Amino acid sequence: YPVGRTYANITIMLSGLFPHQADKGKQYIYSMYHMVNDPFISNYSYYTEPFDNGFVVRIGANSNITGSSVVGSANATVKKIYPALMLGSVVGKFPSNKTGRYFNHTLVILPEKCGTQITALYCVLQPKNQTNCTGHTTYTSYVLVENKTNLKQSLQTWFDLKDCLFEKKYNVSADEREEWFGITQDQQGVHLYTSRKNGFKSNNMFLFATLPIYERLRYYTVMPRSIKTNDHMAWSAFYIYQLHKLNYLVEFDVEGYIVRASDCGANDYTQLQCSYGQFDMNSGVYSASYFNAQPRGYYYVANELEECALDVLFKNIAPQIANYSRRVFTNCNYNLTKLLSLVEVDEFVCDKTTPESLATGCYSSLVVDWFALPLSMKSTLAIGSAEAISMFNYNQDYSNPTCRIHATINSNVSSSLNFTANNNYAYISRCQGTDGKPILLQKGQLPNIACRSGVLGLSNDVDYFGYNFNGRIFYIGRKSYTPRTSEGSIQMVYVITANYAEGPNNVCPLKDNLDSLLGQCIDYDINGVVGQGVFQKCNSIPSQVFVYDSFHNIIGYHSKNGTYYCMAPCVSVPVSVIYDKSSNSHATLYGSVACDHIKMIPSVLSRETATKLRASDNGLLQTAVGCVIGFHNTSDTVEDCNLPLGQSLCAKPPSNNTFGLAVMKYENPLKVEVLNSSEFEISVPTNFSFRVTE
Amino acid sequence: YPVGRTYANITIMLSGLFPHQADKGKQYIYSMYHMVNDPFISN
Amino acid sequence: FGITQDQQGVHLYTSRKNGFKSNNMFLFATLPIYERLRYYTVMPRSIKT
Amino acid sequence: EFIETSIQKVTVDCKQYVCNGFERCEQLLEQYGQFCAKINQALHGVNLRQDDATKSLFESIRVPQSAPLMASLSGDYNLSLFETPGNYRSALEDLLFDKVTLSVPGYMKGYDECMKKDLICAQYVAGYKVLPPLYDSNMEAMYTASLTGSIAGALWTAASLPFAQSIYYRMNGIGITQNVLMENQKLIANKFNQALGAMQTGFTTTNQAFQKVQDAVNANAQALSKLASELSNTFGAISASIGDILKRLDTLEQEVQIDRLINGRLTSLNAFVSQQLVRSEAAARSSQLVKDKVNECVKSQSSRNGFCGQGTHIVSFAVNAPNGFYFVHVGYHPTDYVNQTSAYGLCDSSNTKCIAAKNGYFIKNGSDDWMFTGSSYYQPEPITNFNSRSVEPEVTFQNLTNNLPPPLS
Amino acid sequence: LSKLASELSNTFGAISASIGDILKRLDTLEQEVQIDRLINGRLTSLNAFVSQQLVRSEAAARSSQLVKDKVNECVKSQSSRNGFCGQGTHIVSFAVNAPNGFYFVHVGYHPTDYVNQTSAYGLCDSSNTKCIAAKNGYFIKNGSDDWMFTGSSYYQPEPITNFNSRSVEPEVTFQNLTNNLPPPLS
Amino acid sequence: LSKLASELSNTFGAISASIGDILKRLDTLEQEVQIDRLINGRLTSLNA
Ligand SMILES: *[C@@H]1O[C@H](CO)[C@@H](O[C@@H]2O[C@H](CO)[C@@H](O[C@@H]3O[C@H](CO)[C@@H](O)[C@H](O)[C@@H]3O)[C@H](O)[C@H]2NC(C)=O)[C@H](O)[C@H]1NC(C)=O
Ligand SMILES: Nc1nc(=O)c2nc(CNc3ccc(C(=O)N[C@@H](CCC(=O)O)C(=O)O)cc3)cnc2[nH]1
Ligand SMILES: *[C@@H]1O[C@H](CO)[C@@H](O[C@@H]2O[C@H](CO)[C@@H](O)[C@H](O)[C@H]2NC(C)=O)[C@H](O)[C@H]1NC(C)=O
Ligand SMILES: *[C@@H]1O[C@H](CO)[C@@H](O[C@@H]2O[C@H](CO)[C@@H](O)[C@H](O)[C@H]2NC(C)=O)[C@H](O)[C@H]1NC(C)=O
Ligand SMILES: *[C@@H]1O[C@H](CO)[C@@H](O[C@@H]2O[C@H](CO)[C@@H](O)[C@H](O)[C@H]2NC(C)=O)[C@H](O)[C@H]1NC(C)=O
Ligand SMILES: *[C@@H]1O[C@H](CO)[C@@H](O)[C@H](O)[C@H]1NC(C)=O
Ligand SMILES: *[C@@H]1O[C@H](CO)[C@@H](O)[C@H](O)[C@H]1NC(C)=O
Ligand SMILES: *[C@@H]1O[C@H](CO)[C@@H](O)[C@H](O)[C@H]1NC(C)=O
Ligand SMILES: *[C@@H]1O[C@H](CO)[C@@H](O)[C@H](O)[C@H]1NC(C)=O
Ligand SMILES: *[C@@H]1O[C@H](CO)[C@@H](O)[C@H](O)[C@H]1NC(C)=O
Ligand SMILES: *[C@@H]1O[C@H](CO)[C@@H](O)[C@H](O)[C@H]1NC(C)=O
Ligand SMILES: *[C@@H]1O[C@H](CO)[C@@H](O)[C@H](O)[C@H]1NC(C)=O
Ligand SMILES: *[C@@H]1O[C@H](CO)[C@@H](O)[C@H](O)[C@H]1NC(C)=O
Ligand SMILES: *[C@@H]1O[C@H](CO)[C@@H](O)[C@H](O)[C@H]1NC(C)=O
Ligand SMILES: *[C@@H]1O[C@H](CO)[C@@H](O)[C@H](O)[C@H]1NC(C)=O
Ligand SMILES: *[C@@H]1O[C@H](CO)[C@@H](O)[C@H](O)[C@H]1NC(C)=O
Ligand SMILES: *[C@@H]1O[C@H](CO)[C@@H](O)[C@H](O)[C@H]1NC(C)=O
Ligand SMILES: *[C@@H]1O[C@H](CO)[C@@H](O)[C@H](O)[C@H]1NC(C)=O
Ligand SMILES: *[C@@H]1O[C@H](CO)[C@@H](O)[C@H](O)[C@H]1NC(C)=O
């Protein structure tokens, strides 16, 4: 049941953790003692199954009947037995080369006193170096055994508990009805769900415990349990199903319980139900969506070129802000770790990008602007600033993705790679001309050459100096600053501008197959172009790589080896579901597509159509409107059709269980012939009947 | 040609640096030496 | 032939690219000149007869 | 004159259109409600209503009796434009479907050439699909051919007549007198063929009615292009590709950019659905109009001006069109008029019995000897009991005694 | 109505669909940003409802004119046109109320079995002086001669009588007969 | 006509209904943000 919000008598779409439809799960059986007698077990301590968003256990079921004892050959009444789980984060091997050992802290769930109390202790299980117990060279398995009348005292024999956090005890009333138990881990902890909340009158599960376990459990196993007593009693089998992140369409009843759901990707009819958000449907031809077209792969290629010269940022002297230097990097692969390892970044300001995505991602160029500037005046580089820095020294161009990195270099690293700052540092505090107005600086431009030459010429601070330059006199001003921290470190400012385009995208991150993923929805990352799509091999300019469409949709890819790949969106083939309400049968129309294409994309279809199309062939007919699956050709002609398929084409519902593919026939009127003679033939009735037309 | 994005068989409304229609511009012509010395140029 | 200065440098355009089958111009060079150019002039020359 | 009675039935995959199969976008779309289910139900509703409208229209067009050999067995009336000759379409239907610039999508294997090698080819990338029509192109043409073969039934209270006899009975009830038709049979057929030839040679950019057939196709194409053109718009985001937004930007700002893409796609889909509803209303009105036009003009003769074409109606032919039905109305257009005078009704001086003109006027030939002519053609003739009736005497009736017509003597 | 009512719970990208929760949780600068994106969704819903009501008013006006025509052509009098007033040939129609409109019950004349026959445009003697034509029927024949008259919608051979055959003009395609001529033509 | 003409004075959440005042009062990023919500209102008016 979805925690957080309670619904009642409605029908909505959920996106929680649910098992997929018709999942058989894993079945586990518990045995008795023989007929001294010995435990009987089923190799259950060797499997460390993955957690994978938790699981769900069908505790009980298959009860109240005459079962079979596992030992010998005998029959007895089956009773409900509670499984004991064992959940941990890291696995390993026992010192017998036999798997099933959980290192570090281990959540252990196991019932007490013939299943009337549930104990969930979470701590480390150290093996006990004895004979035939865990931790020796001679070891088969650990068995949790208990008579008829505590399980933890049987756990003390095999394992030795140490440094143990908590032990939660929960009370459960003994019964024989089928019970649902589920486990799920979130940021708050390991939630526990059971069907015994709010009375016990449904199979829905509500949260009853939240154990604090803040590292993720990745594995779980089952204690092999045997109960000391052939034809005495029998124990039920519990089934464990995995939880997947997927969508159901659920329907709540009047007391707000889930009475029916619909796995969206299971059938074609459930794709219809999930696409229209309705359970009870009317007969007709519909339009369904894909609820099983999630990506199942990955592909990444990029051009491999020489390393960009990012080492020029850490040589010569640190530039002044009045005379900063710019470098543009093209047609090379860049490694930004060479920039970010020698500096101590403590401020970044980015737009249209992030520093996490500046390291990856392919651009068309890489413009880097750097100068020395103290951190105390880092607000003068902020957007909208009215200081003298932003109008005469450096105006940032915000039309492109940028990252302004305020970083510092300590004296040890800077002295190692000869980064020095000993000359005077200054900025243009005034750039007026002969006329009394300041010369403002355009976005993304170097300082004005008339003011910059004069400011770099002087060596002392002055506010209204009269410079000459060449011709007209410019009245300039110079103000000094110290970029070096009194500890010894130097403070820098790096502005990195990234230019994206639809072209070749040559500059790519530096790093140290597609034929196996053909026909499936995959995540492709080709030359900085990301998206989703299936890939085929079509016939082939093999230098522009991405052939486009008039709507700028990518329709094909030219590989580097020479082959031409044929991409399409994962949801591209239109699907119509022919549903008949009386027969409760469904059929599928793949409109306007020839029927060779469906056989080579079975992964993106529904979960039942994939298994029908992967096991042998046949069942697919080529009509005038597409390729139908679930039909059969009947060569029957009809005059009216309640499920019109297309171009004068019917669909007779069944009464195997396949729809009949009929055609519409034109009922000819009563043909009369014209006259050459004077006499003209006529058609007169001789019998009538009243008919009504409302 | 608009760099950064290609197009193929489509009428699109562009924007950029283009010359205005029916502009004569400035016409420059080169020559040889005036009549093999004394080269002949304009200003 | 065409020229254009951007924030990434001075671009150079010519119609000889892609086999020289049209009058459209495509970028073939990007000089690393980050000073914004204000003026241009035509240098006179004369070839010998 | 052309009437457009069919909308373009399309189905849009809402989830693929809005979010392109990205789970982050699909997580953000669920806070806008149940948009995709509502849009799917609206498109299915308009498609179901269009199918029902087509079924009802063709059930109204269907005629219980027809003569398939009537259009070929005729006199000098060159009726080969509507003659059924593979393809079951007539000459005019083929001309209409060939002269229009209509790109019919491949219904049987169109995905094999749209990809693996254009609004018929952009539906597989933009996540919509133009549904195939309810009836085949041949089956619609058999309905039209049966209607055309059933035109020449008996106008009075079925019965099969030649085309020449039928247009004779139509023009007799027009007002043209009995004796004019027998004397101008050849001239009438030669005048009919000239008008049909002029309509045949006028299929250019000069007639407005065929331009309406082109504007219907252009309207459908513009609607589909407007639906498909919002996949490239960014709507203020960094790019129109959701994957590029997911790669370039952090978690907090991806919500803002993906939401501003989502709102644009929602607006586009809602505008398309509202346009489909308005076009469905127009199609319903035009379907009722086509029903009335067929049942009145094609199956009878009009007594009302303007309806069934300008002039005065004689015969009408209905053929199929790319988006609706095409009507060819043949009218009676007189050219030269003669001024005359007549009377409400003539009779003798005793006023015992008085008569009135039937389907014409009592013209005067000289100072006396009143004659009768047709109401649409000039042909004086003696007054006969089959072109006049006995009516009540009136105070405005003419009194004559020198020459009495045989009804009066 | 469900579309109008169920879009109050849509957050439209905000943190919540409740104005009070937004006012409590957020500062006065982000409150504007979140309340505005709720407001845009509500305005879109109201404008969509108003436009839909306008289109439905258009449909209601067209259908009201249609119902007026149906009543005055079907219910108060029988109709001479096919297809209208129900399929078949109209005889009588009944109009009753419906939830959102009106319900019409059209009763039609639907023939079942047909008999082929031959008839004539007119019928007169060898003198071709006066000729008659059938009224609401055709002049059928039962053999070599003795032309008779039947109804146009039911087969019943009846003798030709002056109330079911009007006198018309002679025509060149009319039959000539002098053996068993009907009393109108004798 | 009044609905067409009177929705040009609505700010739709922006600081002003005049583009020139927005360009005078805000930096580049907020100019891009605030002009777009005026643009959406004008597009909605024209489409309506
Ligand atoms: C981008 O630049 C960074 C920094 O220059 C590269 O990281 C460097 O990677 C090398 C390769 O592994 C590391 O060398 C290793 O050194 C240890 C001893 O220090 C040695 O035992 C290993 O066998 C190996 O040689 C190096 O330490 C590491 N430097 C830093 C600062 O992380 C990075 O590899 C570059 N990117 C690419 C794609 O090459
Ligand atoms: N010792 C012992 N333990 C058990 O748990 C046990 N369980 C059974 C239960 N046997 C059966 C037999 C048939 C189906 C069966 O037909 N199930 C359907 C699903 C439909 C349904 O029953 O609800 C199936 O899919 O197989 C199930 C359990 C029998 N002997 C036992 N013996
Ligand atoms: C997981 O278990 C390992 C041992 O299997 C722990 O490693 C020990 O840590 C203690 C405390 O720091 C040391 O005194 C031991 O020498 C370590 N032994 C080994 C073999 O590494 C490890 O600390 C545990 N993990 C956590 C998070 O506690
Ligand atoms: C086995 O039998 C017991 C009783 O004979 C079943 O328990 C009942 O289950 C129904 C099902 O809803 C409840 O309404 C009753 O209240 C239960 N009675 C008791 C005393 O608990 C049990 O469900 C049966 N097991 C199976 C698997 O059907
Ligand atoms: C201002 O910066 C520029 C470049 O950042 C300096 O120009 C360089 O000068 C050195 C030696 O003078 C040359 O070797 C380089 O080739 C020059 N590079 C460029 C791009 O011109 C310039 O010297 C600096 N001004 C001052 C006063 O130091
Ligand atoms: C639950 O919904 C059904 C219709 O699905 C309705 O008939 C019934 O009254 C509802 N229950 C309550 C308590 O309102
Ligand atoms: C376990 O494996 C190790 C090496 O893999 C081997 O030396 C040892 O004998 C094995 N022990 C057993 C009980 O198999
Ligand atoms: C167990 O003890 C024996 C001897 O007492 C020793 O040889 C062996 O290594 C021990 N094993 C472990 C896992 O401590
Ligand atoms: C069962 O009882 C016997 C003695 O009654 C005892 O030896 C044995 O350990 C018990 N089994 C357990 C506790 O699992
Ligand atoms: C569980 O049961 C025991 C004994 O019946 C009792 O002491 C304890 O308080 C119970 N705990 C809860 C949570 O009900
Ligand atoms: C620089 O390196 C030297 C030698 O390792 C060390 O003594 C000094 O502390 C380092 N500088 C800083 C700031 O830690
Ligand atoms: C720094 O300069 C000195 C001066 O000679 C030189 O010896 C040394 O190699 C330089 N170091 C680097 C990293 O360039
Ligand atoms: C590619 O061309 C060859 C040459 O005729 C043809 O046989 C093959 O079917 C083509 N493949 C595709 C995918 O078009
Ligand atoms: C069904 O069979 C008939 C006759 O056998 C044939 O004409 C028709 O093409 C077939 N339909 C399909 C889809 O194969
Ligand atoms: C008319 O047809 C109906 C049904 O075929 C039949 O029951 C009835 O007897 C017929 N009447 C005559 C007079 O043939
Ligand atoms: C676009 O391409 C098609 C086929 O390549 C061509 O026939 C057409 O002339 C081109 N231009 C336009 C405007 O459609
Ligand atoms: C009818 O017209 C067509 C072309 O309009 C011509 O080819 C044909 O010969 C004509 N038929 C007669 C009988 O004149
Ligand atoms: C014809 O005579 C009658 C009776 O004498 C008279 O009432 C009527 O006005 C006369 N008509 C004309 C046109 O004079
Ligand atoms: C009847 O007789 C008249 C005059 O003799 C002739 O014109 C007409 O064609 C005849 N009718 C038939 C059907 O022969």
Numbering used by the authors:
A (entry chain C): 50 to 84, 90 to 203, 211 to 290, 294 to 576, 583 to 610, 613 to 727, 733 to 771
B (entry chain A): 50 to 84, 90 to 97
C (entry chain A): 242 to 290
D (entry chain A): 772 to 856, 864 to 895, 902 to 941, 947 to 1198
E (entry chain C): 1013 to 1198
F (entry chain B): 1013 to 1060
Q: What text does the study give?
A:
The S2 subunit mediates membrane fusion and exhibits a higher level of sequence conservation among CoVs.
Notably, the S-trimer of CN-HedgehogCoV was identified to adopt both locked-1 and locked-2 conformations. This change in S-trimer quaternary structure appears to primarily originate from the structural changes in Domain C and Domain D, which affect interactions between protomers. However, such interactions between Domain C and the NTD are absent in the CN-HedgehogCoV locked-2 S trimer. In addition, the interactions between Domain D and S2 of the adjacent protomer are altered: In the locked-1 S-trimer, Domain D residue Y354CN interacts with S2 residues D784CN and K913CN, while in the locked-2 S-trimer, Domain D residue Y354CN interacts with S2 residue K786CN. Despite structural changes, the interaction between Domain D residue S353CN and S2 residue D784CN is maintained in both the locked-1 and locked-2 structures. The same region refolds and rigidifies in the locked-2 conformation.
